[PDB]
Amino acid sequence: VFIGGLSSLVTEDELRAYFQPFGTIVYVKIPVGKCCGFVQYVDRLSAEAAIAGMQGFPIANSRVRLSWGRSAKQTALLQQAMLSNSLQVQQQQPGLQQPNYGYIPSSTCEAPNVSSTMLPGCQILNYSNGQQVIMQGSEAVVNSTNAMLNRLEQGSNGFMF
Amino acid sequence: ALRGLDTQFLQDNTALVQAYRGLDWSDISSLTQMVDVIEQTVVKYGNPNDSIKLALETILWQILRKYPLLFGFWKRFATIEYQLFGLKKSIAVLATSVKWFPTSLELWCDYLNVLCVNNPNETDFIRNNFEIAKDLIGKQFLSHPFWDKFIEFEVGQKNWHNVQRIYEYIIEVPLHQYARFFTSYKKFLNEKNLKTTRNIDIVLRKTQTTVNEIWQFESKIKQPFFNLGQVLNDDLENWSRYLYHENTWMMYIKWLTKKNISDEVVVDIYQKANTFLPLDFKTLRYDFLRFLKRKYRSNNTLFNNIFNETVSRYLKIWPNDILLMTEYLCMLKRHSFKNSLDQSPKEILEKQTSFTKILETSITNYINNQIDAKVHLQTLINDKNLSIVVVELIKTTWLVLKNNMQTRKYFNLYQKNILIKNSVPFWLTYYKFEKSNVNFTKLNKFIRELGVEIYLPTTVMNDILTDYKTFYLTHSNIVTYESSIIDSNTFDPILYPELKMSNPKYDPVLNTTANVDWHKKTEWKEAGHIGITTERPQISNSIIECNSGTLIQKPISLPNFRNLEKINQVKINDLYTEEFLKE
Amino acid sequence: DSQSNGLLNKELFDKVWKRLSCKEKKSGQEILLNNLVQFYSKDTVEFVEKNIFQKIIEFGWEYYLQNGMFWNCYCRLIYFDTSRSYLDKRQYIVRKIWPQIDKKFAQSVLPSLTEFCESYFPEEMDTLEEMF
């Protein structure tokens, strides 16, 4: 997801706190002083929930306009071509190679032994903030609620942001 | 930033001094100006430094030549070439001569005298004192070099045992035993110096850097903390840095504490390593803040003033980071007052009330555009970091003074301020205050206004709403609840937070005109495909809602279309291309 | 003060105390413990001090005393009480609570216990370090 029209008074770790809840992130960059960064999820479904989620949403008193845009390596293959207007031949993102039965899309392993039942109701496989972890349904909610109360005491005293 | 261009600028200004053949006192002072400018950006290699030093010596300005050699030495410690230069110069001096040249030899010896290729420094020093008459000082230098593992140490031993035709082996035993230690150590080290010497090669590659063998060497000088340790570990780190892997310095940070070398030796490394390692890396930086708070245990006002200045350098290079202002205001509360509960009760409260009155008038000036050079807080107070300074005012007023009415007064004034309406730590302290004072009436108004006007991040927006739910279910009863759903709006503190969880701009809006204005919104247009605002054709009066049992009464009216021309017209505002690739 | 006796009732609190007694296996301990802090008044602090935070010391289970999240929560129960002044609240914590920890546990407890001290008590940050 390309995020245009930033305040440029905003770090990457505050921007990561807008786009964490929509899914799991394989983040790429925020370029220096350009007032427009970009974010990258692992599910497409997660991205479209983020676009429709935060369109015209003010970050540090500046309405934010966002849309689809390429990654960092493909940017350089564009910026070499935009000056030399030669071809501009794109390359698509690589496929996941379906079908993966474990993974449920738009879901997070909130923090890091598990011998699960592997049943359909539970989430078997998942993504860590790049390692494929087995989520424990009981241990997920206690670790998410662990970091939830930890963040309110650090956030109030300015340590995390 | 073009390091390559300031090199080329120097080489052509230098060549127009040289090939217009004059001093060109213009082309001289322009070369010296571009060399000063580039130095102040950029750390310079010992080849750049040597050429500058060479030229200033050739136009002979002795005292300025001394100052430039000082500068030279402080960016890149394996400057044994530049030490050796500096020592050959200063040997042309006058009347403090004898002791000035002894000083730079002795300082060069303590920066490079333990390096495997350092023998030419010891030889230079010996030459000078022999060219006096100074048989005892010459012998001391021989004896010093002989106790260090140096490359041709065996040749130097031979040389001293024919040159000392005068007293050779007055104590055969001691000198030949420390030589024997030396040559054991030079054999041990010979493995690593050879694994360095047998890739170290400019290939635009990791053999040029020899980074792998340098890491191996650093590890085997840390683990072998054989007391010559303290100096050997620093020497290997600097020889490794001269070919910018910050984990080499972040391995050296651990070695000094384990070895146990004094606070003066350790603090001058990290003061140097902060400038040597590049900006934006920030791994040895934040650790050094942790060191200065830890070395404060032995209360040094030296240790205080390192911290106040390290912040003021880091705050200018990283202005957006809030962690720094929380660490600075901690030490300002700590090292300025130091109460420790061994005082009168009336004494300590003044030490906090002063801390209010200083902090209150500090923020009032960073909003009215007024800077006071006396108060050090005003030089650091930033519009990214103004928030937490306001917070700690509120946190002191409410907790320490037990003062609510002044605290509540301070919220109303600082709520509408543009710098701190959108602040994480401000509202969470408002959340923590409004949680403790039990009331929900003020607190329900907080969360219903949380996506609409009070714009926090979505990870914190969940964090309040998850926690406030648990808190409301725990502390409130149904009678409290039933009176809070007035039903002009569908808002309910149990159900609303689950609906408004990941949605920031969720609005409970019931209306009949939402049915009338449909088909002209961006949700309808960019329906199955997001981003792409197409104009989908459709039949105006669709029959597909009505049942076939009810249609048979009157005949069906013909199909009124709309938007039928734009079946192929697909429009996209390429917001990535026109605002990022085009600027 | 019309506070609904929330998590503190013989019906629920005994379910919670039976939950706390499992200690290592029940696996949702401190999250349950952190919501016992939330009372912020005269009567309820004296309850939760004696009925859980004192009895957990007296029985002296090992698991809870080594986890610094416990000591951090026991400090935050005292500090945010509206009944105490700043003087006794700085006394009662530093004079009595801080010394009751063991010197062996003070290795792994200190990181979470420093964070309480570094934010609310900068003035008495030295007297923390000398103790351990």
UniProtKB/Swiss-Prot annotation, chain A:
Which domain of life does the protein's organism represent?
A: Eukaryota
Sequence ranges assigned to domain RRM in this UniProt record: 1-71
Q: What happens when the gene is disrupted?
A: Affects the meiotic recombination and the formation of viable spores.
Q: What is the stated purpose of this protein?
A: Component of the U1 small nuclear ribonucleoprotein complex (U1 snRNP) involved in the initiation of meiotic recombination. Involved in the formation of DSBs at recombination hot-spots through meiosis-specific splicing of REC107 pre-mRNA. Collaborates with MER1 to promote splicing of essential meiotic mRNAs REC10, AMA1, MER3, HFM1, SPO22 and PCH2. NAM8 interacts with the pre-mRNA downstream of the 5' splice site, in a region of non-conserved sequence and is required for efficient splicing of uncapped RNA precursor.
Quaternary organization: Component of the U1 small nuclear ribonucleoprotein complex (U1 snRNP).
Other comments?
Answer: Present with 1480 molecules/cell in log phase SD medium.
Q: What is this protein called?
A: Protein NAM8
The protein's organism comes out as Saccharomyces cerevisiae (strain ATCC 204508 / S288c)
* Gene behind this protein: NAM8
Curated annotation (Swiss-Prot), chain B:
Which key words are in the record?
mRNA processing, mRNA splicing, Nucleus, Repeat
Q: Which biological process, per GO, is one annotated for this protein?
A: mRNA splicing, via spliceosome
Which species does this protein come from? Saccharomyces cerevisiae (strain ATCC 204508 / S288c)
- Asked whether the UniProt record includes Repeat among its keywords, one would answer yes
Q: PANTHER family recorded for this chain?
A: PRE-MRNA PROCESSING PROTEIN PRP39-RELATED (PTHR17204), PRE-MRNA-PROCESSING FACTOR 39 (PTHR17204:SF5)
One cellular component (GO) term of this entry: U1 snRNP
Q: Which residues form the signal peptide?
A: none
A Pfam family matched in the record: HAT_PRP39_N
What are the HAT repeat spans here?
51-83, 85-117, 121-156, 158-191, 216-243, 402-436
Q: Which family does it belong to?
A: Belongs to the PRP39 family.
Q: Where in the cell is it found?
A: Nucleus
Cited SUPFAM superfamilies: TPR-like
Q: Further remark, if any?
A: Present with 4460 molecules/cell in log phase SD medium.
Outline what the protein does.
Answer: Function prior to stable branch point recognition by the U1 snRNP particle to facilitate or stabilize the U1 snRNP/5'-splice site interaction. Has a direct role in the assembly or function of a catalytically active spliceosome.
Name assigned to this protein: Pre-mRNA-processing factor 39
Supply the Gene3D superfamilies for this chain: Tetratricopeptide repeat domain
Curated annotation (Swiss-Prot), chain C:
The name on file for this protein is U1 small nuclear ribonucleoprotein component PRP42
Task: Name the source's superkingdom.
Answer: Eukaryota
- The residues bearing each HAT repeat, given as ranges, are 48-80
**Where in the full protein does the shown chain start and end, and how long is the full protein?**
409 to 540 of 544
User: What's a GO cellular component annotated to this UniProt protein?
Assistant: U2-type prespliceosome
Ranked from the top, the taxonomy reads: Eukaryota, Fungi, Dikarya, Ascomycota, Saccharomycotina
* Source species: Saccharomyces cerevisiae (strain ATCC 204508 / S288c) (Baker's yeast)
Alphabetized, the UniProt keywords read:
mRNA processing, mRNA splicing, Nucleus, Repeat, Ribonucleoprotein, RNA-binding, Spliceosome
Protein task: Essential component of the U1 snRNP particle, which recognizes and binds the 5'-splice site of pre-mRNA. Together with other non-snRNP factors, U1 snRNP forms the spliceosomal commitment complex, that targets pre-mRNA to the splicing pathway. U1 snRNP is cotranscriptionally recruited to intron-containing genes. Required for U1 snRNP biogenesis.
Q: What else is known?
A: Present with 1730 molecules/cell in log phase SD medium.
State which gene encodes it.
Answer: PRP42
Q: Where in the cell is it found?
A: Nucleus
Subunit note: Component of the 18S U1 snRNP particle, a subcomplex of the spliceosome.
Q: Name one GO biological process term.
A: mRNA 5'-splice site recognition
GO molecular function terms here? Answer: RNA binding
